[PDB]
Amino acid sequence: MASNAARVVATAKDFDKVGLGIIGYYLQLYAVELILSEEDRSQEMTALATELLDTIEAFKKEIGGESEAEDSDKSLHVMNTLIHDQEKAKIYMLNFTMSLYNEKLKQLKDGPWDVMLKRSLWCCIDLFSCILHLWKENISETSTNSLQKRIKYCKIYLSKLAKGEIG
């Protein structure tokens, strides 16, 4: 819901700290789609939507051209190619999104279970549900079945945490 988007904004900043502007651009697009797909809220929500718009323009200008100072041509190729090519954005997400899920499982096993992990599980599923939902038309009904089963496994761990029990 609207609060779900708020958590994404906080997580979006975390990714910027890692230098994953690619995921930031794709996730920001999901944030606006979430607001429009969200139930109508008081004008306060509209004010937050305007601030998000500033982030979009600020996202492209986030560099300010300072990073371009060196190898400016390379910066445009990476920023322009990944931002303009939607397909390039998805494969980049599968590389990080897929690696993030596997590494996340290791954190649950080697790392302690806390409420913060539960919030990350909801966001991880959102990344897969967002990509699959938009590309759902490009996936076969059976191919989707296999991917949907994978989501159940992720949601399964999430449900066990809700009951307080661990696999």
């Binding site: 697009l29 606006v32 429009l36 109508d40 509209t46 939507a49 305007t50 718009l53 979009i56």
Partner: peptide, 29 residues
Amino acid sequence: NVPEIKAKEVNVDDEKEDKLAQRLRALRG
């Protein structure tokens, strides 16, 4: 005072939001 109820949304807000949506669609276009 007036039993009549006004719609929660207003036509003016509808057009302003449409302009904002057009900017986002242009961003992806």
